[PDB]
Amino acid sequence: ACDYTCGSNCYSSSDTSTAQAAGYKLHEDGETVGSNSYPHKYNNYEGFDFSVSSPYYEWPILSSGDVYSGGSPGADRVVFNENNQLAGVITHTGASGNNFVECT
Ligand SMILES: Nc1nc2c(ncn2[C@@H]2O[C@H](CO)[C@@H](O)[C@H]2OP(=O)(O)O)c(=O)[nH]1
Numbered sequence: 024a025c026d027y028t029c030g031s032n033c034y035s036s037s038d039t040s041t042a043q044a045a046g047y048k049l050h051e052d053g054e055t056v057g058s059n060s061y062p063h064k065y066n067n068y069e070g071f072d073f074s075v076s077s078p079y080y081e082w083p084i085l086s087s088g089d090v091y092s093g094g095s096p097g098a099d100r101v102v103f104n105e106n107n108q109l110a111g112v113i114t115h116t117g118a119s120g121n122n123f124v125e126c127t
């Protein structure tokens with residue numbers, strides 16, 4: 024069973040932890056990868072009800088299980104905060120334009 028489902032993509036907690044660890048490490052070293060400069064601040068324009076505190080940062084989580092290193096980011100993202108806490112897992116899949124909806 025999936026811990027998180029983003030559209031058709033199935034993710035386990037290990038998947039999200041691995042993705043978060045890579046993005047958080049880049050955040051600490053003050054480095055970014057890709058044309059869209061990940062990881063970067065996530066403003067929560069959508070108004071999701073995150074239980075943990077801000078600031079939030081978004082980082083791509085890939086369906087292949089591979090850690091994002093620069094190319095096409097895909098539709099899925101893990102959102103983490105300054106204390107290395109997972110705020111949520113979101114996706115552009117099933118959402119209009121560049122909006123996001125939460126993975127279930
Ligand atoms: N939809 C959305 N985009 C955000 C948010 N915070 C930052 N962004 C960025 O604001 C712009 C419009 O969506 C994009 O550059 C997007 O970055 P990403 O495209 O990298 O997600 C947010 O909370 N919601």
Ligand SMILES: [Ca+2]
Nearest residue numbers: 034035038088
């Ligand atoms: Ca997996």
Ligand SMILES: [Ca+2]
Nearest residue numbers: 087088089090
């Ligand atoms: Ca692989």
